[PDB]
C-alpha cells in the first residue's frame, strides 16, 4: 500500500529482566509418559538475560514511538503480556529490504498471514483500528506495513476468525534451522500487573514452515488504537543457545519440569 509518514520518530529505552525458567518447548512430537528424557537443542538457558520493551497502542500527542529491530542470533524466545491483543506479529530477515527475501508473520483480525517476499517495508509499520460507535465494536481498517512485495516465495492465509479487540501471556519460540522456521507457542492467563511472570510452562509446537531463508534480525508489529481525543502491552526477548536439557514427562505426556544441565554443577550432577 502506501506507508504513513511520521515526522517525529522515537523509541523507548530498552529494559532488562530475567528469563526465570521459561522457554521450554517440546523438541519432538513423541508421546512420552512418566519418564526423564534428555535432548540437546536450541533452548533458552535458565535465568538468561532478557530485553523487554513496550508497545504503545494509543496516542494522547503527535509522537511516533517505533519498535526496535533486534538481532535473531540462533533463535528467539518472544513473550508478550497484554490484556487486549496489541502484539500482532513480526518481520524477519537479514536486510529487511527489497534486496533479500523477508518473512512476515502478521495477525489481522480476520486470519493469520505468513508471507515470504522481497518486501520493501515501511519505516513505521502501521496497523490502525477505529471504534465503530454505531456497532459498539472496534474495526481495524489500516494496514500499512510494506510499500512493495515482489517475487514472493511463500504465502499462507489461515481460515477467517474474529479476534476480540486478567492479563494474557503469549509465549513463542522461533527457530530457523535447515530451511525450516519452527514456531512453538503457549498461551496462559496471567494475573501479574508488571513484568514477566516467574514460572514454568512448556511451549507446544505451533508450526514449521519450509521458508528456506536467512534470518539475522527481526522487528515487532503492534496495533494502533485511533481515538478522537495508558496500559500498554509489554514484550520480552531472549536468545536460544545449544544446550542439553533433561525434560520430565508426566503420565499424560505434559512436560512438568526441566533441568538445564550446564546451568551449574548441581544440574550437571542431576
Amino acid at each position, epitope marked *: 500500500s502506501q506507508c504513513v509518514n511520521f*515526522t517525529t520518530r522515537t523509541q523507548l529505552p530498552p529494559a532488562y529482566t530475567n528469563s526465570f525458567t521459561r522457554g521450554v518447548y517440546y523438541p519432538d512430537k513423541v508421546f512420552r509418559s512418566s519418564v526423564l528424557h534428555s535432548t540437546q537443542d536450541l533452548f533458552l538457558p535458565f535465568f538468561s538475560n532478557v530485553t523487554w520493551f513496550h508497545a504503545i497502542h494509543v496516542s494522547g500527542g*503527535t509522537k*511516533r514511538f517505533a519498535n526496535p529491530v533486534l538481532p535473531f542470533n540462533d533463535g528467539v524466545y518472544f513473550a508478550s503480556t497484554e490484556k487486549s491483543n496489541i502484539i500482532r506479529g513480526w518481520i524477519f530477515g537479514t536486510t529487511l529490504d527489497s534486496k533479500t527475501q523477508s518473512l512476515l508473520i502478521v495477525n489481522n483480525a480476520t486470519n493469520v498471514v505468513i508471507k515470504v517476499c522481497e518486501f520493501q517495508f515501511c519505516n513505521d509499520p502501521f496497523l490502525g483500528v477505529y471504534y*465503530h460507535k*454505531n456497532n459498539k465494536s472496534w*474495526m481495524e481498517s489500516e494496514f500499512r506495513v510494506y510499500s512493495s512485495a515482489n517475487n514472493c516465495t511463500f504465502e499462507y492465509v489461515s481460515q477467517p476468525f474474529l479476534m476480540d479487540l486478567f492479563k494474557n501471556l503469549r509465549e513463542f519460540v522461533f527457530k530457523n534451522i535447515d530451511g525450516y522456521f519452527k514456531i512453538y507457542s503457549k498461551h496462559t492467563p496471567i494475573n501479574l500487573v508488571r513484568g514477566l511472570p516467574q514460572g514454568f510452562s512448556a511451549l507446544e509446537p505451533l508450526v514449521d514452515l519450509p521458508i528456506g531463508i536467512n534470518i539475522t534480525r527481526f522487528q515487532t508489529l503492534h496495533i494502533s488504537y485511533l481515538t*478522537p*481525543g495508558a496500559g500498554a502491552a509489554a514484550y520480552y526477548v531472549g536468545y536460544l543457545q545449544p544446550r542439553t536439557f533433561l525434560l520430565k514427562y508426566n503420565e499424560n505426556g505434559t512436560i512438568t519440569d526441566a533441568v538445564d544441565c550446564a546451568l551449574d554443577p548441581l544440574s550437571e550432577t542431576k
Partner: antibody
Amino acid sequence: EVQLVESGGGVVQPGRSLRLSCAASGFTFSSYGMHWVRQAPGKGLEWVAVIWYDGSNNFYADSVKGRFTISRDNFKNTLYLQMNSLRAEDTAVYYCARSYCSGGFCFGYYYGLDVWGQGTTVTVSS
Amino acid sequence: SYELTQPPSVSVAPGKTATITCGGNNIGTKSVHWYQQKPGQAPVLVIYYNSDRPSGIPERFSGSNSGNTVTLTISRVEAGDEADYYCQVWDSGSDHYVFGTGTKVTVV
C-alpha cells in the same frame, strides 16, 4: 471567524497549468487536514487530494495523480493545489475543506469536512 | 475504485420523512459522513461519524449504520430541506475519500 477563502481559478486552454490557493483564518490551521473537492457543472462531488496537518502525508485521486500537487504553508495558513497538464475534464468549481486530525492521524473516521470554502471556478476549454 | 451508491432522486411531502440510501461495499465497516448542498452554495456537513450532528444542524437530521444499512433520515421535512445529499467515506483499501453519486431531494 472560521472561514476558508479559495482563489487562483481561471479560464485556461488544455495543457496549461494553474495554481489554486485557499487562505484559512479563524482557527488552528496546523490542527486540521486540508482537502480539495471539485464539482463539475451539473455533476456530483469528486475528491481531489488531501494533505495532513503537518504536510507529512498526502493522498491523491487517480484522475489527477501525476498532474496535481498539494501543499500547505503553516506559517501563512494557506493551502495550495498545483494543477499541470490540465484537460477539459478538469473543469469544475474547486473547494477546500478542513477536517480535524486526532493525534497525528487525519484518516477521517471520527471527523468529516465540517467547514467548506466558497469555492473557485476552473474552466478548461480550447 | 471504491463505489458509493445513492438513489438519484427522492420525493417527499412536507411533514413526512425522507430516507436516503448510501450503497457501499462492506460499508458496515466504514464511517459514513453526509453533506447537504443547496443549489448555489458549498455543501454543509450534516451528519458525521455515521450519527453525530454538528453543533448547528437541527435534530430532525439523523444517520444510521447497522446491518449494512447506512441511512440519512430527515423527519418533519420542510421546503428548505430541498437540496442534494451526498454520503462520503474514507476507503483505506484504495487511499481514497469517496463521495456518493448523490440524491436530489425535492419536496412534493
